[PDB]
Design a protein around this nucleic acid. Sequence first.
DNA 1: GGGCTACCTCTTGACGGCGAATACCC
DNA 2: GGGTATTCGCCGTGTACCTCTCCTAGCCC
RNA 3: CCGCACCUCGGAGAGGUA
Lengths: 388, 417, 48
Amino acid sequence: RKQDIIFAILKQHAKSGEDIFGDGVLEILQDGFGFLRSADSSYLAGPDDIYVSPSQIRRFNLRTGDTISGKIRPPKEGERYFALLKVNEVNFDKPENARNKILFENLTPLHANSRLRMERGNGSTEDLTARVLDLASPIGRGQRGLIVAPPKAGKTMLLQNIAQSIAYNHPDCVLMVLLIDERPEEVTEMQRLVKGEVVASTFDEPASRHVQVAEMVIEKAKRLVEHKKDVIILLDSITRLARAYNTVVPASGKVLTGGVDANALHRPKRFFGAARNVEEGGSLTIIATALIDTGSKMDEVIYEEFKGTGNMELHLSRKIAEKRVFPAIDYNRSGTRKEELLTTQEELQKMWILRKIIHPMGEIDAMEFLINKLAMTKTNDDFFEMMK
Amino acid sequence: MNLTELKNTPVSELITLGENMGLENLARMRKQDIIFAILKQHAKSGEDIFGDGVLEILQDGFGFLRSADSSYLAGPDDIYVSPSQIRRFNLRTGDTISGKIRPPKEGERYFALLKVNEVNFDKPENARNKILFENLTPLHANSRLRMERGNGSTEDLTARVLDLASPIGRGQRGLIVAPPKAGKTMLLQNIAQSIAYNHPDCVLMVLLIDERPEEVTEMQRLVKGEVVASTFDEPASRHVQVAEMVIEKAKRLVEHKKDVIILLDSITRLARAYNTVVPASGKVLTGGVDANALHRPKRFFGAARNVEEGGSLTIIATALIDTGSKMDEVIYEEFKGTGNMELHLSRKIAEKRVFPAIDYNRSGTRKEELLTTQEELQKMWILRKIIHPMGEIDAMEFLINKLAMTKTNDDFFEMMK
Amino acid sequence: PPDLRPLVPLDGGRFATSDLNDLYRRVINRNNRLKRLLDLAAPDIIVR
DNA sequence: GGGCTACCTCTTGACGGCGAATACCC
DNA sequence: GGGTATTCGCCGTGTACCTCTCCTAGCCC
RNA sequence: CCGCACCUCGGAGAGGUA
């Protein structure tokens, strides 16, 4: 109802002669034209979307994901969308700065160089999760990891803790938590808890909207990276997204074990590998949560295929989660490749000694030891100094 | 007017040149489109344009000239090759063609080839009369390709251990068997650097299929040679196409008495790609391997051979084991009885941070007497008989402590007696 | 309406399309071409 | 051999006779 | 301004029924 | 369908019939 009221108000205001302003993310269709979707509707096709002529797209070399803000006009007799007259701001910047840009496909990838420390530093009991995460698997800019965990392991609490630690330590980073095929109540809870942008697509609509929202989000992330921004995407839907792609892919006659199409894992693997660290400027970090032991062999095949792709695995133990010990992290199975590029020599040596001491002990025993050692102090520096 | 020369030029200079030529705004344009417009404007004046690339004959009969900087990917700037010229010069997939080209006219989308100037970096009169690769007489490794640096560097220890464990010659067909997280990347980097340093005359080609883009751009900026790779973001079809183009180029080079060296790091990934692209036949073996899926990787591996008339083809593939997938285990067990060199790496030694973590016991080379002298072979036999009783970690520590004392292995062998 | 100008159902992938459908397709093609060309601001001769 | 899409070539001829384009004077 | 030579090509093909045939593969890729 | 091995339904043309 609000959209029709705004439409009528804008019409009455344009009848007087005043200017009308709009904003939205561009979604170029296959025919050549596009529309400016809205953020409050999770990039959903609305009746009051702003039409974008192909002439302006050719003039400014606009692509899917470009945030466009400019003057619009109400539709005339025979039109159903707002025509874009003049664009004022492109991607929160002037068009003269966006015209001389380098495409995302030409950026040179690199390994994680900058250290994104997750430790809060306030000495809270909730900071233990971030401390264990930093001790087990340090995360840097451009990291491409996977949160491997069975159902009912603590993915929600761990994701909330990660989001809060990111918003606390690194408020300059653009945090985007894209939740696909999840409960609406959980979406509402997350949106009113984390300090950032929350786009979601619940199961109430088919997988086409899921794929469309995923494409819009990845295009916006690529454009922001092109504009020298540090984008961090926490997509806890990678398994759901792979299921959606396998459901919407045309049959090719080559079905793998478990009901997986031969060309179904192409789009999600490309979405995952899109994350990379750019040397010219900016980075893209994608932390996804994979589902295992869900009773379906399709998810097992998806996990086994995506295991050889990322460079960071955070395994969670079902036993430790059932014992109500959070975070229930499998320290032995966790780790990060090329960790010497994110940690110093002494920090790497301390982590190596801690792993050599923890490995002989059992999972529950190692977790109890780590908790008892971290409870004695507030910062990990005192723990490191006492271990020696 | 060469295509590669304009491809090596930066974006800023090309934009400046295009603006000086008086064309549409090139700032909001792709570099390839800028080069295309510059070539069009330069050909409108009447001047000639030249290009080059590797030929890829299609199934219909025509073909294109792929570029090496794009990993033989389908580009808009590919030079069309009519089947008439193919039938006139007996061209095949892999022949390097360099000749005059022209921009596409109205209704065309690719450059056309008018006159071919150089074939396979040689005169066409020498290429018209040649012996096919399938007719060359194979032979064992005769020439010794020593990997030792000799500069006394600390990184030369890996090359020294490799020479003491498995010497490599021209035409060798080996396998680098190692579980994940063992150090295959550093070992391959050291091998490539030692090959580029000791034998700069050989054509080095590093194939990386289904790997991370960061590792690709790292290897491309580290080794002194050609790097053709295909990240995991590409389908298995592109993997198969790249493998076919690389092996065809290698065969065409060997046909001209050239020493080609191929450092494969994805034999397992290549076999997985071939098993994915093969149509289902309703018969699946143990582990999920098709009956006719391993034939193409089998031929790709067996293509390596030493030619008596001239040239050689060396293929060093790194196989993956203990990856948790039975398919890779079946692939490794099938390819084990095929090659003639196995360099095993131990995960237990890699966990102790003892680099390099090489399993000296299971390593070895068949017909090693053809690449080493009598006294050298006797010293290697004595060293193996001394190392065999000791454990793997203990033998590795002993070898490292004994090689750290001297610079050359000859002094170590002389001190052992 | 489409029922008054239907496609003749015959065996095979080919179809002896009605002349009216062919004319409508040609008109739609020639209209979409002009619609996409008028935004590009083509020279007057081509537009005419 | 093929994708949406574009090139083949010509200023059925008589009429049966009816209304009417440019023309020649009265 | 009008009454009429030539003429550019403007629309009727008896009615009903029966048998048979013809029905796109092109281009630089 | 994931791994063999025991110790406490159409358009044009041709021919014909009344």
